[PDB]
Design an enzyme around this catalytic site. Structure first.
Site, PDB file in Angstrom:
ATOM      1  N   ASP A 170       0.892  -1.138   0.000  1.00 55.45           N
ATOM      2  CA  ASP A 170       0.000   0.000   0.000  1.00 55.45           C
ATOM      3  C   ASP A 170       0.927   1.183   0.000  1.00 55.45           C
ATOM      4  O   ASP A 170       2.047   1.085   0.497  1.00 55.45           O
ATOM      5  CB  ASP A 170      -0.828   0.017   1.247  1.00 55.45           C
ATOM      6  CG  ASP A 170      -1.786  -1.130   1.286  1.00 55.45           C
ATOM      7  OD1 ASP A 170      -2.508  -1.275   0.292  1.00 55.45           O
ATOM      8  OD2 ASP A 170      -1.823  -1.883   2.286  1.00 55.45           O
TER       9      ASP A 170
ATOM     10  N   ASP B 104      -3.863  -4.216   6.496  1.00 54.27           N
ATOM     11  CA  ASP B 104      -3.919  -3.469   7.745  1.00 54.27           C
ATOM     12  C   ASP B 104      -5.315  -3.410   8.357  1.00 54.27           C
ATOM     13  O   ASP B 104      -5.539  -2.751   9.373  1.00 54.27           O
ATOM     14  CB  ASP B 104      -3.346  -2.057   7.538  1.00 54.27           C
ATOM     15  CG  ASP B 104      -4.364  -1.083   7.018  1.00 54.27           C
ATOM     16  OD1 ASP B 104      -5.055  -0.471   7.858  1.00 54.27           O
ATOM     17  OD2 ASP B 104      -4.477  -0.933   5.781  1.00 54.27           O
TER      18      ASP B 104
ATOM     19  N   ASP C 249      -8.524  -6.692   4.668  1.00 52.01           N
ATOM     20  CA  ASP C 249      -7.467  -7.442   4.005  1.00 52.01           C
ATOM     21  C   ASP C 249      -7.282  -8.861   4.527  1.00 52.01           C
ATOM     22  O   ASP C 249      -6.544  -9.655   3.934  1.00 52.01           O
ATOM     23  CB  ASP C 249      -6.142  -6.697   4.140  1.00 52.01           C
ATOM     24  CG  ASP C 249      -6.298  -5.213   3.981  1.00 52.01           C
ATOM     25  OD1 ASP C 249      -7.081  -4.793   3.108  1.00 52.01           O
ATOM     26  OD2 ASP C 249      -5.632  -4.463   4.725  1.00 52.01           O
TER      27      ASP C 249
END
Ligand SMILES: [Ca+2]
Ligand SMILES: [Ca+2]
Ligand SMILES: [Ca+2]
Ligand SMILES: [Ca+2]
Ligand SMILES: [Cl-]
Ligand SMILES: [K+]
EC number: 7.2.2.10
Length: 994
Positions: free
Chosen positions: A351, A703, A707
């Protein structure tokens, strides 16, 4: 402090002599700590075993080998020379050795489990406690909590140990002890005693069991017990033993501990056959079955000598020591077995925000005018370091440092940055990091003034809470911000009205500092500030400004730009109506452009170079993000995922574009993609699926519960330390900082923890194959035997077992990131490696059956001499052909076997020095790199000299002390192994891999 549930809160505070107002004290901690240990549960139960089949192959050999030594002398203990004492004490020798083989094999067994203990500082409860040293709470590790100290818990907290509640700070306190009791609902606790010493936990309505969490409330208490003395601790300890599946490296290694055993088991059983011609002969009592138990001993011995011991334990060390190593770097491995995969990572999915990027706006570029007299103006462009809201960083010009104060233009640029702002900096002493207050884009300015510090204020001395808004305040002490003209999208700018502070007048010094988006602000500038001067806004200058504002806003960095200017002669406050943005654009006219700053979200520390590293190691870095394709693509060229002018019209996609493609086009997107923008939560898992289809081991950052699936599906799930508890338990590894550069390092250590093992394997194998070649090359080209049973046992112990364990303490190899990631396909040992092995082992074995050959045959000034008709020695009987000042009993001589065995040992240590790193030089990584090695070498080299010179022994070992020349030989005979391997390393280092 057991049965604390039946004692007053006082009786407990007493039992620990701790004041609940300030809790424990340093020495009390250390004191109680030692008396009760750390708040953890050990591994006293069996949860590990010696994976190799051969470890149980050898132990049976050394048992049966001994048997032979008890039948040997026994069958016929009487010889013409009664008992030579060098064939009588053998039973006493081998046994004296198996004992050493043990004392050593359990020496490495400890370090292996001593390092495991080093990794007990992971993700713990982090309970809160009160101690003497400080008055405020202390977020300390659960394990660092001793019985006796004061612990407090609020809503959601997890109970770190058994606590005898002292005070309940909230109207009530319910707790969730579902995991330990048949209670599904949260129950209440109280602060009084529960007399009955043998009541059940359900009735211990005044205790907080460890591993529990509170439904509602806050409350202080005193730790009764910790560790295995805990209610949940007496449970987990008394639990069912757990079993596990096995990793592809273990499988591949077990297949290895199957190849060797077999081969070995034939290299030796082939000795008790190549020596049939000597079972009857004299030397062995002149009988058959008696020699058939001597060459048995040698084989069953040669075996032991070859069987590379220590592997399981050694690995476990590299592994342990490595994870220890990763943790120092913020990579908290949650699954040892996974670190194995870690070096097979071939694609990282990260990310952007927080991980690849800091997510803290930072000004990194700014300029102002320099000269303009010749209708062609230059500027003063400065660059700024430091990529977060912390005052740290420095102003640069042409990559060189300068004081912001030496440039008068800058003093005003700061004054604007300082005054035309509504944000600030705050030091969160709690998190020990600098925070922003308000908009980032503004705050970014605040931090610039600090890094600028145009008035050379003294900072270093100040406290963090002090350095926050230092330089910024100085400016506020010299310029009073009267009123401000709020932002508005019509003029896309804002400004403030200021005048000297404390100045007790009016209509003097008044200024309006305006800050805004370039164009508009520049078109309202009729004057342009140079030095401290001010020359009208000509047509050429205004061109120069916009030119860089382009070179900046478009370039690879794609910096966001802000225009800074001041209204020198502002209207008077009277003639100003401040209640509608409509008029503000007007007051903001007739400006004197001061300068421009360019900000951007900088890439976290090292991330820029880590991505370059992955690149060198064939790892695909795919950025997942919320940005828009365009900006996202940008951020990639900024960080490196994409070259500044590399075409990537097909390696960036947005959620929608992706869902719009057909399955076959989606799978393809993934084998090439490098950036994904505006992705639906379900795309990560989809992305990984397509990634797995190309047999790619993938590390995916996550996170949030969002996910959880993706994290699980990935080869390696990686959770943000700032993430949710769910995501952390879903990943195999955690980033303490949430920095991408970590993963890359964790990955790298993986490569070393592998290479370490390879150093360990190569040293035994290459060395032992060398022993087996000596025993063989003599029995081959026919020669006086070079070694006997107890000598094989000796060599074993001195070159396997100890300097072997050492290597597990070898340090991280170099240039380990220029190879492609390991594929669980490729074999344990590469063909060239095997060569590299036999190349060495084939040499050592030569040097040995080439050291004694130097003793027997010619030698500068040797005590004995003959010729290569030494290969027929056994037929010597004074036949009168090849006779000289020699007797057939000279082929029994001890020194040859001693010039041999001594070459062996020394050559191997010279070789162990080659196992410091797979393909590096002793030049680029000295022998002293690993101390324990030098040590273990000496500690063994010593046990050797001791066997040779200490009279009561060299006799048992059929050895005969060598002199300084007889040892200077052993050196020149063994030391050239370094030279060789150092070549193989050279080759590989440049010709093989490339
Ligand atoms: Ca009370
Ligand atoms: Ca061995
Ligand atoms: Ca597969
Ligand atoms: Ca050895
Ligand atoms: Cl009480
Ligand atoms: K997994």
């Amino acid at each position: 402090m057991e049965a604390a549930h039946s004692k007053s809160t006082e009786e407990c505070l007493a039992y620990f002599g701790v004041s609940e107002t300030t809790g424990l004290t340093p020495d009390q901690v250390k004191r109680h700590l030692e008396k009760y240990g750390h708040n953890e549960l050990p591994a006293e139960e069996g949860k590990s075993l010696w994976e190799l089949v051969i470890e149980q192959f050898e132990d049976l050999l050394v048992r049966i080998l001994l048997l032979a030594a008890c039948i040997s002398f026994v069958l016929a203990w009487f010889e013409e020379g009664e008992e030579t004492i060098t064939a009588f004490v053998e039973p006493f020798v081998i046994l004296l050795i198996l004992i050493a083989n043990a004392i050593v094999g359990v020496w490495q067994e400890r370090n292996a489990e001593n390092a495991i203990e080093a990794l007990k500082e992971y993700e713990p409860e982090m309970g809160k406690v009160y101690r003497a040293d400080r008055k405020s709470v202390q977020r300390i590790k659960a394990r660092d909590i001793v019985p006796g100290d004061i612990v407090e818990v609020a809503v959601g907290d997890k109970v770190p140990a058994d606590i005898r509640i002292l005070s309940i700070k909230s109207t009530t306190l319910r707790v969730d002890q579902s995991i330990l009791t048949g209670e599904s609902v949260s129950v209440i606790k109280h602060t009084e005693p529960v007399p009955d010493p043998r009541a059940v936990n359900q009735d211990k309505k005044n205790m907080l069991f460890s591993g529990t969490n509170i439904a509602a409330g806050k409350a202080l208490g005193i730790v009764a017990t910790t560790g295995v003395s805990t209610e949940i601790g007496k449970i987990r300890d008394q639990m069912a033993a757990t079993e596990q599946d096995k990793t592809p490296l273990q499988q591949k290694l077990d297949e290895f501990g199957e190849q060797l055993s077999k081969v070995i088991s034939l290299i030796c059983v082939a000795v008790w056959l190549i020596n049939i011609g000597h079972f009857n002969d004299p030397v062995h009592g002149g009988s058959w079955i008696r020699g058939a138990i001597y060459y048995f001993k040698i084989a069953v011995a040669l075996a032991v000598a070859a069987i590379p011991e220590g592997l399981p334990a050694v690995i476990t060390t590299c592994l342990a020591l490595g994870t220890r190593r990763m943790a120092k770097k913020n990579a908290i491995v949650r699954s040892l077995p996974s670190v194995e995969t870690l070096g097979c990572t071939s694609v990282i999915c990260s990310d952007k925000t927080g991980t690849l990027t800091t997510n803290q706006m930072s000004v990194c570029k700014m300029f102002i005018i320099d000269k303009v007299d010749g209708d062609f103006c230059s500027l003063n462009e400065f660059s700024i370091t430091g990529s977060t809201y912390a005052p740290e960083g420095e102003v640069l010009k042409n990559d060189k440092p300068i004081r912001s104060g030496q440039f008068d233009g800058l003093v005003e640029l700061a004054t604007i940055c300082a005054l035309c702002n509504d944000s600030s900096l705050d030091f969160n002493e709690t998190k020990g990091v600098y925070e922003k207050v308000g908009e980032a884009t503004e705050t970014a300015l605040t931090t610039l003034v600090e890094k600028m510090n145009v008035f050379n204020t003294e900072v270093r001395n100040l406290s963090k809470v002090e350095r926050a808004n230092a330089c910024n305040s100085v400016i506020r002490q010299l310029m009073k911000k009267e009123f401000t003209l709020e932002f508005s999208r019509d003029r896309k700018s804002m400004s403030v009205y200021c005048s000297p502070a404390k100045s007790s007048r009016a209509a003097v010094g008044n200024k309006m500092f305006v800050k805004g988006a370039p164009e508009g602000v520049i078109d309202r500038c009729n004057y342009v500030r140079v030095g401290t001067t001010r020359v009208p806004m000509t047509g050429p200058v205004k061109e120069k400004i916009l030119s860089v504002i382009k070179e900046w806003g478009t370039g690879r960095d794609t910096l966001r730009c802000l225009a800074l200017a001041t209204r020198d002669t502002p209207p008077k406050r009277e003639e100003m109506v401040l209640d509608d943005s409509s008029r503000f654009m007007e007051y903001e006219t007739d400006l004197t452009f001061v300068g421009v700053v360019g900000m951007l979200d900088p890439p976290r520390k090292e991330v820029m170079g880590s991505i370059q590293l992955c690149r060198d190691a064939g790892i695909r870095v795919i950025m997942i993000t919320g940005d828009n394709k365009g900006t996202a693509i940008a951020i990639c060229r900024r960080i490196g995922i994409f070259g500044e002018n590399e075409e990537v019209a097909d390696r960036a996609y947005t959620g929608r574009e992706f869902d719009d493609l057909p399955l076959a086009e989606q799978r393809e997107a993934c084998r090439r993609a490098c950036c994904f923008a505006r992705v639906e939560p379900s795309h990560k898992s989809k992305i990984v699926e397509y990634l797995q289809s190309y047999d790619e081991i993938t590390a995916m950052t996550g996170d949030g519960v969002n996910d959880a699936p993706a994290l699980k599906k990935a080869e390696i799930g990686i959770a943000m330390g700032s993430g949710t508890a769910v995501a952390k338990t879903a990943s195999e590894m955690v980033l303490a900082d949430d920095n991408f550069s970590t993963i890359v390092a964790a990955v790298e250590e993986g490569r070393a923890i592998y290479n370490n093992m390879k150093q360990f394997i190569r040293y035994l194998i290459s060395s032992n194959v060398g022993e087996v070649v000596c025993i063989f090359l003599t029995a081959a080209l026919g020669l006086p035997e070079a070694l006997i049973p107890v000598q094989l046992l000796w060599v074993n112990l001195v070159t396997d077992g100890l300097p072997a364990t050492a290597l597990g303490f070898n340090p991280p190899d170099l240039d380990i990131m220029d190879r492609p990631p390991r594929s669980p396909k490729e074999p344990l040992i590469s063909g060239w490696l095997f060569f590299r092995y036999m190349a060495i082992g084939g040499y050592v074995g030569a040097a040995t059956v080439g050291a004694a050959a130097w003793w027997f045959m010619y030698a500068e000034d040797g005590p004995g001499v003959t010729y290569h008709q030494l290969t027929h020695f056994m037929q010597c009987t004074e036949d009168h052909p090849h006779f000289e000042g020699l007797d057939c009993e000279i082929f029994e001589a001890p020194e040859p076997m001693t010039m041999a065995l001594s070459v062996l040992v020394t050559i191997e240590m010279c070789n162990a020095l080659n196992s410091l790193s797979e393909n590096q030089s002793l030049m680029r990584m000295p022998p002293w790199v690993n101390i324990w090695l030098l040590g273990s070498i000496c500690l063994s080299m010593s046990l050797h000299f001791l066997i040779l010179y200490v009279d009561p022994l060299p006799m048992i070992f059929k050895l005969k002390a060598l002199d300084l020349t007889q040892w200077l030989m052993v050196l020149k005979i063994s030391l050239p192994v370094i030279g060789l391997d150092e070549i193989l390393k050279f080759i590989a280092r440049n010709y093989l891999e490339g």
